[PDB]
Amino acid sequence: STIEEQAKTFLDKFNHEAEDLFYQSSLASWNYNTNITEENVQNMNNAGDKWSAFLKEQSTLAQMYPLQEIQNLTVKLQLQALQQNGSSVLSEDKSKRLNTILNTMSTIYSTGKVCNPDNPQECLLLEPGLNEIMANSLDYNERLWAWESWRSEVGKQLRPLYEEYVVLKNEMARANHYEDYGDYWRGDYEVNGVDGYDYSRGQLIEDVEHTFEEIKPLYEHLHAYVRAKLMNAYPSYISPIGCLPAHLLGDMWGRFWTNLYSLTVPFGQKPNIDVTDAMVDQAWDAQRIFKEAEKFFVSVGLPNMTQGFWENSMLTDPGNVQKAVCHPTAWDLGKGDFRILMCTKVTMDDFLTAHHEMGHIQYDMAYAAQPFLLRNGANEGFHEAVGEIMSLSAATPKHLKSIGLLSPDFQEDNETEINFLLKQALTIVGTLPFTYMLEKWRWMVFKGEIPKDQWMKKWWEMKREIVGVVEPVPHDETYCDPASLFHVSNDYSFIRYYTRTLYQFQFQEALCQAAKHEGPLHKCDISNSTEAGQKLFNMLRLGKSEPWTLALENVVGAKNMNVRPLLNYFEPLFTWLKDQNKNSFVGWSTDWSPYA
Amino acid sequence: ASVYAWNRKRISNCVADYSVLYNSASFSTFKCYGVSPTKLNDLCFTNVYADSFVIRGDEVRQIAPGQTGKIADYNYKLPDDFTGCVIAWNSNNLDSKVGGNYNYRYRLFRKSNLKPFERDISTEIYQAGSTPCNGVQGFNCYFPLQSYGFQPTNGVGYQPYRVVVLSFELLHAPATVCGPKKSTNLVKNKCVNFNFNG
Ligand SMILES: *[C@@H]1O[C@H](CO)[C@@H](O)[C@H](O)[C@H]1NC(C)=O
Ligand SMILES: *[C@@H]1O[C@H](CO)[C@@H](O)[C@H](O)[C@H]1NC(C)=O
Ligand SMILES: *[C@@H]1O[C@H](CO)[C@@H](O)[C@H](O)[C@H]1NC(C)=O
Ligand SMILES: *[C@@H]1O[C@H](CO)[C@@H](O)[C@H](O)[C@H]1NC(C)=O
Ligand SMILES: *[C@@H]1O[C@H](CO)[C@@H](O)[C@H](O)[C@H]1NC(C)=O
Ligand SMILES: *[C@@H]1O[C@H](CO)[C@@H](O)[C@H](O)[C@H]1NC(C)=O
């Protein structure tokens, strides 16, 4: 009869015939990932083609129902999600050109091998050939050679491709009623039609700048301390008044500073909280790691894992004969089937990863009651954040003592907390200026603020201004330095890490306040607290049915992303860094003072 | 049978031993509405209606008086004043295959809700919009019977569950489905209380 009833029946018809097809596609993808065989690749491709064609036909049918005559929020949200054209609005020639460009960029990035001129008999790929060199070398010219050679080859190949990519994506976005591709990416956080909880696409950039202005003093002190330590490590290259050299940050692109913990350690003589030897002595299998993680989740009040999870997951490496992707991934295959694909080793990193992926599984299980097209996180940040909070809670010394992995008489003094917090800062705080600068640069490129002939001159100027990292040698417009990273080259959003990082500490403060923890935020464990689990599960059960602002109100009591929990988490470290930086100069100069 | 075309078997002119069903550990749900399982083996009824079908794990809750859902409104409707027992058990071993078992269908759309103990096996195209469907499956016109997907690796809320609903009614005709009466050993030559055939 009415438009709303027609849409509700159509959405029921969609969810019913889309859950089974998604289950077939997901199962084929799982069979490919655990068993890399050519027939499995063919089955995955066939299932993906069927899924894409079915989604195209359902979207085409879905567009015939006008949005303004539907008053139910859930029905309107599902219809809004289905009615997106994507690349379908664009012409077939341009769509095929865009798909070809994406595939060729994927092949160039994945199969890119670069080695030194005059010795070309064998070369090293990015993973793990160049990653190990960037993370472990202490030689200035070798790191400079690797960084410049990889950016030379990858950028010179990818620069015309990126020039075509920006134009095609902007054309598709303007055909889809968006200002640019940046607006298309920012539309994920757009909330419309809810009274008081509305969020605009234009507000996201302003909120990111407002948070980053408060991020900047902590980052400046951390950068000054890292600069002083790198000056100790490399005597002449680093200047007291200038920026850090780009190739010395411990990673290929500068994404994380976690590889500088050895060089920048406050107290090297003091021990770490490594628990690997304790698990090795007691013969802890990967199954025991997942059982301990399950015990942690039942401790906080969340439901335990299904029988299908234990029966169907691959938690050990299969062998030499059977090939599998080693990356840990949580799979929500559909119809209540939740699995974890991880080649779990007896390490602390795998244990924290197991907690993170089981957090992903718990998040997936929570919104199973919701309709099929709303079975996702409220935004891209929450989905990773719920795993990151488990990673934070599991890594605490209190949890390790509780589960028996650490000695009950281990002394937790201030020095271990300072060095652990500095490592967490290098991993978490350090990625924030790089993420913000990259996303702001991409938004300005899509918006047309920066002309094509001035992309790199602005970019380094941004990097000096924001990241405090200077180029080793000037680069002209023949280089394509941003596209050397995995996310940007393969058409992925990058603001998820920034939102995840802020939401992580906001959730951590909310759960710790719920659990009545009375000390420092970093010393908080959320085990044994039913109320914290209930508060988490209230947001977890919603999925994508409700706006992310309402979900954030449900957890932390705020209608917007906040920067105060992050600063509260690193406050002891912030005071320590401020005390230690009295002799040195906080802040950097954008000039070419160290090297150019 | 499928839930849209649930089989009804009338059980009459025999002795119904209900303790065999109750003491089995193979049943996940043995919920009795309007009568208790302990006194079923003693009472006598005119006829027993056994309705049999297969539904999902999450849809077992809807086979009860007063419930709302796809199965209750469009597939199998129970009266509020229902006396009988709903027995359900997991059938992942038999009703699920690796390729997918699509032999079981359910009615997804109907113009009105079903009456109690009604079977609808019509295969007419559902009209969700003002437009005349005209027999063709196009826009706003959907097929009412949708297949079910059963895989052995599915979750417990999506695995197939076989449901048998026993309906007990008493009519003016003499009740012939009686419970087993039992018997003790016979003791002679003593003053005892005898109960021979009532
Ligand atoms: C992996 O694939 C091979 C080759 O098709 C097959 O023999 C083997 O049984 C498969 N193993 C698993 C665990 O699927
Ligand atoms: C919107 O539709 C859902 C069906 O998914 C229904 O449960 C809910 O009550 C509806 N909300 C309103 C306000 O009508
Ligand atoms: C999708 O594209 C069709 C045809 O190009 C157009 O009529 C429709 O309005 C578009 N919908 C959206 C949401 O862009
Ligand atoms: C999960 O929890 C339920 C209820 O607490 C319990 O019956 C079940 O055995 C648990 N599952 C496992 C694998 O222990
Ligand atoms: C740790 O506490 C001791 C005792 O007050 C103090 O002497 C020392 O300076 C502290 N170290 C740091 C890094 O705060
Ligand atoms: C949380 O509960 C478990 C089991 O009840 C207990 O063994 C554990 O010690 C508790 N955690 C703490 C920190 O006491």
Tab-separated table of N, CA, C and O in Angstrom, chain A residues 86-87 98-99 101-103 105-106 109 158 162 165-166 168-170 172-173 181-182 184-185 380 439 442 446 482-483 485-497:
chain	number	residue	atom	x	y	z
A	86	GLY	N	27.614	4.357	-6.048
A	86	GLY	CA	29.007	3.948	-6.122
A	86	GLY	C	29.537	4.344	-7.486
A	86	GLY	O	29.341	5.476	-7.942
A	87	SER	N	30.214	3.416	-8.153
A	87	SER	CA	30.787	3.691	-9.464
A	87	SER	C	29.787	3.481	-10.593
A	87	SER	O	30.129	3.727	-11.755
A	98	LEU	N	38.783	3.219	-14.254
A	98	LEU	CA	39.036	3.352	-12.820
A	98	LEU	C	39.362	2.002	-12.191
A	98	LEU	O	40.267	1.905	-11.352
A	99	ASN	N	38.627	0.953	-12.584
A	99	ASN	CA	38.888	-0.387	-12.063
A	99	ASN	C	40.257	-0.885	-12.514
A	99	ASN	O	40.985	-1.510	-11.733
A	101	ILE	N	42.822	1.034	-13.262
A	101	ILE	CA	43.799	1.834	-12.527
A	101	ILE	C	43.981	1.284	-11.115
A	101	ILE	O	45.113	1.163	-10.625
A	102	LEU	N	42.874	0.914	-10.455
A	102	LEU	CA	42.958	0.351	-9.108
A	102	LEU	C	43.701	-0.982	-9.115
A	102	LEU	O	44.556	-1.228	-8.250
A	103	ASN	N	43.399	-1.845	-10.098
A	103	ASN	CA	44.055	-3.148	-10.183
A	103	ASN	C	45.545	-2.996	-10.470
A	103	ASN	O	46.368	-3.701	-9.871
A	105	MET	N	47.466	-0.397	-9.814
A	105	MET	CA	48.121	0.137	-8.620
A	105	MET	C	48.324	-0.958	-7.583
A	105	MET	O	49.357	-0.987	-6.902
A	106	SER	N	47.336	-1.854	-7.445
A	106	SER	CA	47.461	-2.985	-6.529
A	106	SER	C	48.617	-3.895	-6.931
A	106	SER	O	49.381	-4.353	-6.073
A	109	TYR	N	52.049	-1.960	-6.317
A	109	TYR	CA	52.394	-1.924	-4.899
A	109	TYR	C	52.732	-3.309	-4.359
A	109	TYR	O	53.699	-3.461	-3.602
A	158	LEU	N	53.668	5.688	-10.236
A	158	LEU	CA	52.307	5.966	-9.791
A	158	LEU	C	51.831	7.403	-9.990
A	158	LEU	O	50.646	7.661	-9.749
A	162	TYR	N	48.044	8.373	-10.290
A	162	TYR	CA	47.374	9.122	-9.232
A	162	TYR	C	46.669	10.347	-9.801
A	162	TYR	O	45.595	10.734	-9.316
A	165	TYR	N	43.599	9.095	-11.151
A	165	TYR	CA	42.764	8.590	-10.062
A	165	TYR	C	41.985	9.703	-9.374
A	165	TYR	O	40.794	9.535	-9.075
A	166	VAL	N	42.640	10.846	-9.122
A	166	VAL	CA	41.967	11.951	-8.437
A	166	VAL	C	40.841	12.510	-9.309
A	166	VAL	O	39.737	12.781	-8.815
A	168	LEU	N	39.161	10.935	-11.781
A	168	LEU	CA	38.071	9.970	-11.927
A	168	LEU	C	37.237	9.892	-10.653
A	168	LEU	O	36.000	9.820	-10.719
A	169	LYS	N	37.895	9.899	-9.486
A	169	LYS	CA	37.163	9.802	-8.229
A	169	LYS	C	36.348	11.065	-7.974
A	169	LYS	O	35.220	10.987	-7.470
A	170	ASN	N	36.906	12.237	-8.315
A	170	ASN	CA	36.155	13.484	-8.199
A	170	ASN	C	34.958	13.495	-9.143
A	170	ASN	O	33.888	13.993	-8.779
A	172	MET	N	33.273	10.848	-10.234
A	172	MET	CA	32.292	9.923	-9.676
A	172	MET	C	31.573	10.555	-8.489
A	172	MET	O	30.356	10.398	-8.336
A	173	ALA	N	32.323	11.246	-7.621
A	173	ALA	CA	31.735	11.866	-6.437
A	173	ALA	C	30.790	13.006	-6.811
A	173	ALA	O	29.713	13.138	-6.217
A	181	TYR	N	35.733	13.735	-3.634
A	181	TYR	CA	35.899	12.412	-3.042
A	181	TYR	C	36.114	12.500	-1.534
A	181	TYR	O	35.768	11.562	-0.801
A	182	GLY	N	36.708	13.603	-1.065
A	182	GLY	CA	36.874	13.804	0.367
A	182	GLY	C	35.544	13.913	1.089
A	182	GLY	O	35.385	13.382	2.190
A	184	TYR	N	32.857	12.484	0.027
A	184	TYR	CA	32.330	11.124	-0.042
A	184	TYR	C	32.868	10.288	1.112
A	184	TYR	O	32.130	9.501	1.717
A	185	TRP	N	34.163	10.430	1.413
A	185	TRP	CA	34.742	9.722	2.552
A	185	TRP	C	34.198	10.259	3.874
A	185	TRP	O	33.949	9.487	4.807
A	380	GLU	N	33.391	3.785	11.238
A	380	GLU	CA	34.583	2.957	11.084
A	380	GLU	C	35.471	2.957	12.328
A	380	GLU	O	36.248	2.015	12.516
A	439	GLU	N	45.445	12.898	5.637
A	439	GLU	CA	44.033	13.094	5.320
A	439	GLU	C	43.728	14.534	4.922
A	439	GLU	O	42.931	14.761	4.005
A	442	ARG	N	45.029	14.996	1.366
A	442	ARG	CA	44.163	14.333	0.397
A	442	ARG	C	42.856	15.098	0.217
A	442	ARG	O	42.338	15.193	-0.902
A	446	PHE	N	41.539	16.651	-3.286
A	446	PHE	CA	40.209	16.403	-3.841
A	446	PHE	C	39.412	17.696	-3.983
A	446	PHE	O	38.681	17.877	-4.965
A	482	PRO	N	53.138	10.351	-1.459
A	482	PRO	CA	52.048	9.763	-0.654
A	482	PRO	C	51.627	8.357	-1.046
A	482	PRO	O	51.418	7.525	-0.159
A	483	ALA	N	51.566	8.043	-2.345
A	483	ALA	CA	51.016	6.776	-2.828
A	483	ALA	C	51.888	5.557	-2.536
A	483	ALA	O	51.492	4.447	-2.909
A	485	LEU	N	52.232	4.324	0.344
A	485	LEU	CA	51.599	3.659	1.474
A	485	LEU	C	50.451	2.778	0.980
A	485	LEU	O	49.845	3.047	-0.061
A	486	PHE	N	50.182	1.702	1.732
A	486	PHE	CA	49.209	0.686	1.325
A	486	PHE	C	47.782	1.227	1.241
A	486	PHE	O	47.051	0.911	0.294
A	487	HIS	N	47.360	2.018	2.233
A	487	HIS	CA	45.964	2.450	2.313
A	487	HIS	C	45.589	3.430	1.206
A	487	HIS	O	44.517	3.310	0.602
A	488	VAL	N	46.454	4.405	0.933
A	488	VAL	CA	46.145	5.435	-0.055
A	488	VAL	C	46.198	4.870	-1.475
A	488	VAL	O	45.358	5.208	-2.320
A	489	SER	N	47.150	3.970	-1.750
A	489	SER	CA	47.303	3.421	-3.093
A	489	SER	C	46.173	2.474	-3.475
A	489	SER	O	45.923	2.283	-4.670
A	490	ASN	N	45.488	1.879	-2.499
A	490	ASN	CA	44.458	0.887	-2.778
A	490	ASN	C	43.056	1.386	-2.438
A	490	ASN	O	42.167	0.569	-2.173
A	491	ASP	N	42.862	2.713	-2.430
A	491	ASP	CA	41.564	3.382	-2.252
A	491	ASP	C	40.919	3.031	-0.904
A	491	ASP	O	39.817	2.483	-0.828
A	492	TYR	N	41.647	3.326	0.172
A	492	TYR	CA	41.141	3.133	1.526
A	492	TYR	C	41.152	4.438	2.311
A	492	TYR	O	42.060	5.262	2.160
A	493	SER	N	40.130	4.611	3.148
A	493	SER	CA	40.042	5.753	4.050
A	493	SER	C	41.110	5.657	5.134
A	493	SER	O	41.445	4.565	5.602
A	494	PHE	N	41.648	6.810	5.538
A	494	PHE	CA	42.736	6.836	6.504
A	494	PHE	C	42.379	7.507	7.824
A	494	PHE	O	43.177	7.428	8.764
A	495	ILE	N	41.195	8.118	7.945
A	495	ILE	CA	40.818	8.841	9.164
A	495	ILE	C	40.317	7.896	10.246
A	495	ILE	O	40.119	8.322	11.401
A	496	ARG	N	40.131	6.614	9.898
A	496	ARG	CA	39.677	5.606	10.851
A	496	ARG	C	40.658	5.436	12.000
A	496	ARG	O	40.234	5.192	13.129
A	497	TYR	N	41.961	5.564	11.736
A	497	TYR	CA	42.956	5.414	12.793
A	497	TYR	C	42.884	6.569	13.788
A	497	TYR	O	42.996	6.354	14.999
